[model samples]
Target chain A: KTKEQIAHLKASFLQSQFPDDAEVYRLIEVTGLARSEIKKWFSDHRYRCQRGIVHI
Target chain B: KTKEQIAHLKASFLQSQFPDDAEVYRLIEVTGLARSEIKKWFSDHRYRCQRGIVHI
Candidate 1:
């Protein structure tokens, strides 16, 4: 259940150019992942994007 | 001492397009930072690079 929510948030994050803080909070509300962890995931995915790595 | 070494490694990392594994090991040898921490720095910097953040 948690894994699926995280997956969903990750998908949404990947699609957006930049997610607002409120959106992140909403995700936190939905997924129960730590704020730091979610932020790190975004950072990591951005790295992948810059490297031209297909992360879908 | 460790901070200085880490700064040096960060400078080197920024200049290079991509660093090989041996180079990373050399940094580990020089700085004594854990391998995981060094890798995380690289990943974080790569994220910054992708985001066009001026990190120099």
Candidate 2:
């Protein structure tokens, strides 16, 4: 995914506890990323954040 | 919220795109934090992460 897409995901994630199914679908449609990929990115991002690693 | 509760929130947010209503309620019951406070922390945490701030 592009940095812009990641940025959007980061922003959206912060605003809500989690994205609903529809939001996930919409992100997939807009970013052309597989559902699994999106999920993985989020997972990784959170791990990094939790460990005090800054991700942009 | 305690650090441990924040840690849980961080983990849960990563696994799901967005927490459903039930999950939100569960968190409240578990964490003893109000719904609005949880949402705010998520929002703030995301903002920091997006800006490349490390959060523990």
Candidate 3:
């Protein structure tokens, strides 16, 4: 729900693209994210993360 | 080059859903149409034309 919240979650949680099922739950609650945007964001970020392209 | 080309051609081409093989090729010379654009335009008109929306 808040950018700051999602930002913190990203810092701690992204050990890999497409977080494990456990973290999917964690991500939604902490970020107040609708699964739609979070899943959408994760797929976008996760794809970029795999590429050589800079993730910043 | 002219809207007249497409406008008149639409009257001729769309006798029914999807112009026949002869009509598509016939359609090309009359309108100076690229087949790709003519096909797409036919599809565009056919869609709105069927649903009874104004074709303007």
Candidate 4:
């Protein structure tokens, strides 16, 4: 619903795409965004949407 | 570490780059990727990594 909300969703998705054991920190690092911000975005998105829905 | 996985990481990082409660939905809306693909990507990535590390 909100920009931040969408961001969280995006971050969570990004995290999933990459391998778990792989260098995730590097994933966010390339983005030039804060680690906390990345983590928080996923948390919020998850809270809002318990079920998965796809929209572009 | 696949290309799709990397895309997910980029999307998630992009989400965190923006502000919460902000216009995040608009960001993804502009991107051309399906929302479900995005969500699933993150879910997969999250499950893979319990620990955080950085890689380019």
Q: Proportion of native contacts found in each model?
A: 0.03, 0.06, 0.00, 0.05
B1-54 in candidate 3: lDDT tens per residue?
Answer: 246433432332233435566665665555555767656654653454334322
DockQ scores of all models, one per candidate: 0.03, 0.05, 0.01, 0.07
Higher-ranked by TM-score: 3 or 4:
3
Of the candidates numbered 2 and 3, which has the greater TM-score value?
Answer: 2
**DockQ category of candidate 4:** incorrect
Model 4, position B36: C-alpha lDDT score: 57
Question: How many steric clashes does model 3 contain?
Answer: 1
lDDT of each: 0.50, 0.55, 0.46, 0.45
Put down candidate 4 lDDT per residue, A1-56, tens digits, no spaces: 45765565655444443334234576565655456655664555444333333211
Error of 2 at B46 (Å): 1.3
Off by over 4 Å in 2: A1-48, A51-56, B1-17, B53-56
Steric overlap count per candidate:
0, 5, 1, 23
Q: Model 1: per-residue lDDT, tens digit, B9-28?
A: 23422433244677667656
Chain B: TM-scores of all predictions: 0.57, 0.56, 0.56, 0.38
Model 1 chain B weakest 10-residue run by lDDT? B8-17
Cα shift from native, residue B29, model 3 (Å):
1.1
Error of 2 at A25 (Å): 17
Determine which window of 10 residues in candidate 1 chain A has minimal summed lDDT: A5-14
Worst 10 residues of 4 chain A by lDDT: A47-56
